[PDB]
Amino acid sequence: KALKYLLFQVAKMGDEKVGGVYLRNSSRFKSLKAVYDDLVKSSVSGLPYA
């Protein structure tokens, strides 16, 4: 539940630059999603059925 919530928060975040400090948040969801699908979604939790 927390991990799904983290994905939502990361997506909404945007690129911010207040004078002196800069923070590119754009290229985080792209990276985060790839791990998420690979290590969480693409992992069966049961048995198939013939």
């Binding site: 979604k41 693409s42 992992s43 069966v44 939790s45 049961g46 048995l47 198939p48 059925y49």
Partner: protein
Amino acid sequence: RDLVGMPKIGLPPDYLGEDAEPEKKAFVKYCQEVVNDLIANDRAGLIWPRFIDPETKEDIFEFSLVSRQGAKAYDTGSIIDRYSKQIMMAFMSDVLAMGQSKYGSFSLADSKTSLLAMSVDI
């Protein structure tokens, strides 16, 4: 083992499991009955969910019939027929397959004794 035309259902891994949400587990149960009870009757048909993932540009759920992309090399039908004739040739019992002819006979004293009929004479 000719599984061509067999129904195949592809579900996301999330659906398949024990910790899946009751709604998902109910869906898997219905697919089990669909697999187990689908026939080609009058009311045959399907209402399946369809979602083309924006990523990968491919759908996640599909109901498809498994297909083969080749043909069996050797024609088993003509192969067996050759051996059956060879077996009958060994015992010279071609009358079993060909049948009684109008120029062959089983009579020993006749002038046209069949090959098999003469064998019993020996």
